[model samples]
Target: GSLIRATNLWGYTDLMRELGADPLPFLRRFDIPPGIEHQEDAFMSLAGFVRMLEASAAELDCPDFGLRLARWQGLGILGPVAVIARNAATLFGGLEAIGRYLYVHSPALTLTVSSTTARSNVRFGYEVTEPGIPYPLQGYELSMANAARMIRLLGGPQARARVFSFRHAQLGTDAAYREALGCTVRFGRTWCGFEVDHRLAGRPI
Candidate 1:
């Protein structure tokens, strides 16, 4: 899936080679009966499929190729999209629009935000479209984590933000949420999201 999607999005089969590796061996290890030459439209499933491969291969020493593939796709494809969209609106509007348009592509995820001037608060909430599955939540975490990182990258280190998420069966991993978001994280909440000063939404990105 990664190979297919990478090929489609990047229009090159030598990505693995360019990255100093071979993908065939990795694909074979997963019992992915490889054949047919790559086609542009055929690789659309790469993101989700590669994610599955990554999760299953975690226990093994899988060279972290899946992560590399994700990064490649992001840099080669999604990164361009984000860059083009970087100037479209203020930070809040950009996030709101991106979440609305892109959230559907990840079927098992949802992000919603509401702002209140009187309360001087903005809340963003996230949830798995399929709660019982771990993959969607993992994707959700990455989405929030990366968004928070990108906000800082695009704006500045002083960008005001706070992330809140629901308590999962897992606990110790909460530290990562805080570390990645670089903000106060609240657990045991009904929804997941972040807050910023309402006035900040008016600032241009």
Candidate 2:
């Protein structure tokens, strides 16, 4: 018995017809029962479905690799910090809160005010506690990038007025980043800072 009827097979038939191919032979090869050929009520058992899925999984490699890569690529230590930023009433408040929270995860990364100006900059220069292990610059890079996107989504044009990161300014999404952030990005720096025009803090999303 089939859960889908002949009418439901139109999509497949139409595709085959468009390609100048017949679908009857292909349909017959599946050994579909004729009693429920046009019925939608005929269904497969849960066990049968599981068996089919298992067989399919055996045939397919890397079924979820792309999703796994995306998860790995986007995850960062600042995720919780970013979440708390939603409570901020202003862009400046959110940035300050996030910067403060980010340090809790990696003490090596600290936010400090410029000696001459009140504006804060994040400094990445630190002695690693684990000398044998490589420093996690990639994680820092992703965290800053995620912060920029989040600010843009939350604050819109006002968020656009802020700058994020000075390390390797050439992002993968260069064109979109340039359009979203109207500022020059500089690379080869010890740290990345989300620089906002102090005036833009009070601006609306």
Candidate 3:
């Protein structure tokens, strides 16, 4: 089953209200409990999660909705997995912990950290195992932003992605992605993820 912790919706209602849209209707439409955002252990279908995001963006006319919502989230949203990541010895190890344990949040998703041929850079990103999810741009943006934020948290404020790539076409503008992710943003890539300088990966957590 494609399930994710409802805690992923932390600050969702507040973000919706700030954008001048009521969140209750969207939550109900997705079959997510009205107050699930405040619950720590509730789970929902990943398909419904993506649909809720798409519908909210369409209805509220907020193309950058995912990026904006990401601003409201961080490592805490990972649940106890945050602690697992935080306890790793190096930044790279932290990400590895996430890769190993993220199934707790969504078995349908994956986090990959791989090396380039030259070994000077690391390719870091995630994959969604669920198929037939149309234009999951919001989910991509939210996940990438969350990844970037987690890297910074685990590796210190100076940590940054050298390049952020998306499988979909650019959502709003280059500036919008750069602003949300704090890195150069690329689109239309075969894979959605970010690149990190190899040195940054070894930084003690």
Candidate 4:
């Protein structure tokens, strides 16, 4: 199914309110009805979720929203998926598990792994679509930041991206990127992705 758990948008409305943007009307305009986010098992289309992020970013005039949302959200929102990651035999295996069964968390999203001579890369994206506005930038940074966050979660506090790519133009200063995501980050890429030297990909979970 292309329906993803609405729970993934857990703190968005409250976060937007904190940012001083009226989230309800804006969200509903995109077909996310009132209180729909509150239902335990309510499902929302994958595209609606992405639109929610993008539209909220536009309303707030917050081009750096993905990181801001990440800063506020941290990894707590991963919920049960973190448990699934925690049980894996290796770091790569944990990522693989999350990639393989991500539908349990969000439909249409994917985390594909590609092995190279020196590195293993993981790319984040969703294939589904809806006839509406899109925000590749909002989603791209969110993907980069969260994937970077998750790598740190699984690999440890000292973890750093072997290589990072973002499809969006640069939105912040070097210090901002460095502080939020360890190591230098590349912008204007064909895709949003992260790479870990094979050394860490094989590390035990």
TM-score (all chains, Cα) for each model: 0.59, 0.44, 0.95, 0.82
Candidate 2 Cα outliers beyond 4 Å, as residue runs: 1-80, 103-109, 113-131, 135-137, 167-182
Per-residue lDDT over 54-140 for candidate 3, one digit per residue giving the tens place of the 0 to 100 score = 898888888888888887788988888988989999888888888899999889888787896865588877787787677688888
Q: What is the lDDT for 10 in model 2?
A: 19
Which should have the higher TM-score, number 1 or number 3? Answer: 3
Q: What's the TM for model 4? A: 0.82
lDDT of 2 by residue, 31-115 (tens): 4443332443343222222222222222333222111122222213244565666677776666666557644434434555232
After superposing candidate 4, which stretches have Cα over 4 Å from the reference? Answer: 36-38, 72-80, 118-135, 173-175
Candidate 3 lDDT score relative to the true structure: 0.85
Q: Note the residue pairs that clash in candidate 1.
A: 108-129, 124-193
List the lowest-lDDT window of 10 residues for candidate 1.
4-13
lDDT tens digits by residue: candidate 4, 5-50: 6665666777888788888787777677678667767777667667
**Whole-model Cα lDDT of every candidate shown, in order:** 0.49, 0.41, 0.85, 0.69
What is the alpha-carbon lDDT for the whole of candidate 1? 0.49
- What would the per-residue lDDT of candidate 1 be over residues 125-151, giving only the tens digit for each residue? 665454333443334444455556556
Best model per TM-score: 3
Which runs in model 3 stand beyond 4 Å of their true positions? none
- lDDT comparing candidate 4 with the true structure: 0.69
Task: State model 2's lDDT.
Answer: 0.41
Q: Cα RMSD to native, each candidate?
A: 6.3, 16.4, 1.3, 2.9
